[PDB]
Structures are given as C-alpha cells and as structure tokens.
Design a protein around this ligand. Structure first.
Ligand SMILES: CCOc1cc(F)ccc1-c1nc(CCOc2ccc(C[C@H](OC)C(=O)O)c3ccccc23)c(C)o1
Ligand SMILES: [Mg+2]
Ligand SMILES: [Zn+2]
Length: 313
C-alpha cells in the first residue's frame, strides 16, 4: 500500500513529456510502466503482485522482432500516459485503467508481418479473423493472459465494470488497425467542425479513444529526430523482411517493403507524414488541445525528412 515506485531525477522529469524515450535498459521498462499506472490511475488501481505478474507474462508474449516488440508496447503506453496526464479531468476511472493496459497489450504476439501478408500467405489467423486480423489476435492474447491464475488485475471490479473495461480494451486494440484510422479521423473531423462532437456520447468517446490509440501507436514520429531516425531503421527492417517474404510467394512487394528501393525511403516517410501522421495529430490537437506538442514534434520530423531528401543529411 505504502510502496511507491520512484525514478531517477532525469526520468522523473523527462517521463512527463510527450517526447520521452524509455531508454535501452529493458529491466527498467516494467518499473517505468508501474510508475505511469500509479500516477495516471492511483496506487490502489491494481494489486501490485498481480500487476507485476501480468506485466511479465505480457513481456514474455512479445517476440524478438525489430520494431513490434516489448519496447514498442511500453513506448505506446508512455504516449498514452502523457495524453492522459495532460487531459486529467476528461477520462473516467475505468478508461485510465483500461487504456494503459490496452497500449501495453496492443501488439501482443506480433510476428512482424502486416494483415496483408497474413492474407496472401493464407495464415490460419486470416481464416479465423477476416478483417483487423492481427488486432483481433492481440485482443485474444490479452484475454488469455488476464485469465492465467494470479493475472486478473481487474478482479476487484464489479461484473459490469469488468465487461466495460474489457470492452474499452477491445475497441482500443481494434483501433490500432491503421486501415480503420482514415474513416475514424474523417468522422471526428466532420463532427468537430459541424460542432456535433459530444464527449457524453459513448460512440463519440470510442472514436476519440480510437484516434488517441493511433496517435500513441505512431508516436515514434513525435520523438526528437535522432530517436525518430533510428526507429525508422527498425520499422523498415520489418517491412523489408515482409517484402522478401512477398517475393518468396511470387509477388512484387510495394516499393516501401522492397529492400532494393532503400533510396525511396525519405520520400516514403514524407508521403506517410503528409497522408497519415500530420492529419492524425492535427485532428487530435483540435479535439484535445494539450496534445499539441505531438503535432509540433511531428512537423519538426517532417522538416528533418525534407532535409534528408535535399541531401542536407
Ligand atoms: C508500422 C507503423 O508505421 C509507422 C510508425 C512510425 F512511427 C513511423 C512510420 C511508420 C510507417 N508505416 C508505413 C507503412 C504504411 O504506409 C502508408 C499507409 C497509408 C498511406 C495513405 C494512403 O493514401 C495515400 C491510404 O489512404 O491508404 C500511405 C501514404 C504514403 C506513404 C505510406 C502510407 C510507413 C512508410 O512508415
Ligand atoms: Mg499493431
Ligand atoms: Zn503498435
């Protein structure tokens, strides 16, 4: 009850900022996540023993892939922590519990391949889940781990509160399917601009939590340039492996995934910032004004990618 997690001074200060990097020491990430749950949620939200056992089983079920790994999970959870802490009064007790857990769990047992590749390979998961293939698997793995003995971090909720939090976690994890993001943001755009966006409307909340999940999932584009630049190597390591596997199925991969077209990377990042990231953090800053540092950092990185293209690095 009286056992607080504390962090060294630099982390204690820097963790409050959107652009925080959790660092290269894996053994500190669980402590970082618990610190964020205790300040974001309370010290009583979860039984520490259950939380610790939950965190370590989640970690165990992330794979050693270049990008969609345990570090990505904690990174995505930290971005959500920063949003939640900068919008204190807007979210319910249950949303704060569910969203940090959703973010830690959002890519559980990812193999480093897109939904597309699973579908062209004819992976069993593509038979079982026709759309948002990996995301329905990620949620399924979340429920599995929650059902391990000693792992029910929600045990103290009512029956109906339990179903609400698992429903928040399900929608949050599905929303990380970037195919669903485009429509979701367009709707939030129209609702915000016609003044119909209503945070007491549960279907409106769901959409806004969906956009937060995309914002947290893409948060590599909101770091200081050297972090953004080095993460892009991990991202493309996975994409190029997938392109290789496409070529093995006798399919020319899109140029993004083709490691023979590395030269096209800076222009592909431009396209991605213009088509995906900038619109994402724009609509998010409109709906949640305190998230503006994410938009500003994203624009700075867009400018760094233009500089790469102009041969200025
Ligand atoms: C894995 C998570 O993805 C990232 C996370 C990051 F922190 C930074 C970059 C990517 C990243 N993802 C991609 C792959 C997805 O790429 C795209 C998806 C959708 C569209 C938009 C498309 O309209 C043009 C649409 O609506 O589908 C893109 C447009 C230009 C370039 C890449 C695009 C790239 C190149 O960089
Ligand atoms: Mg994912
Ligand atoms: Zn992710």
């Amino acid at each position: 009850g009286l056992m607080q997690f504390t962090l060294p001074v630099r982390l204690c200060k820097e963790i409050e900022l959107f652009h925080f990097d959790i660092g290269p020491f894996e053994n500190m990430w669980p402590g970082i996540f618990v610190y964020m749950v205790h300040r974001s949620c309370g010290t009583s939200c979860f039984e520490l023993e259950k939380l610790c056992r939950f965190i370590m089983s989640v970690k165990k079920n992330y794979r050693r892939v270049p990008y969609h790994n345990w570090k990505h999970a904690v990174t995505v959870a930290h971005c959500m922590y920063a949003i939640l802490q900068n919008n204190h009064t807007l979210f319910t007790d249950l949303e704060r519990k569910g969203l940090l857990i959703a973010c830690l769990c959002h890519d559980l047992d990812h193999r480093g391949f897109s939904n597309s590749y699973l579908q062209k390979f004819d992976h069993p998961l593509a038979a079982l889940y026709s759309t948002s293939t990996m995301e329905q698997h990620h949620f399924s793995q979340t429920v599995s781990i929650l059902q391990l003995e000693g792992h029910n971090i929600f045990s103290t909720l009512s029956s109906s509160e339990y179903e609400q939090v698992l429903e928040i976690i399900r929608k949050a994890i599905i929303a990380t399917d970037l195919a669903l993001y485009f429509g979701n943001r367009k709707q939030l755009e129209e609702m915000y601009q016609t003044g119909s966006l209503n945070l007491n409307n549960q279907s409106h909340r769901d959409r806004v939590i969906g956009l937060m999940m995309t914002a947290c999932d893409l948060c590599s584009v909101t770091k200081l340039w050297p972090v953004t630049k080095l993460t892009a190597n991990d991202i493309y390591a996975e994409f190029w492996a997938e392109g290789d596997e496409m070529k093995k199925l006798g399919i020319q991969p899109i140029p993004m995934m083709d490691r023979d077209k590395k030269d096209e990377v800076p222009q592909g990042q431009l396209g991605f910032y213009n088509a995906v990231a900038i619109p994402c953090y724009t609509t998010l800053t409109q709906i949640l004004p305190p998230t503006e540092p994410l938009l500003k950092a994203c624009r700075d990185n867009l400018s760094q990618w233009e500089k790469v293209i102009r041969g200025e690095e």
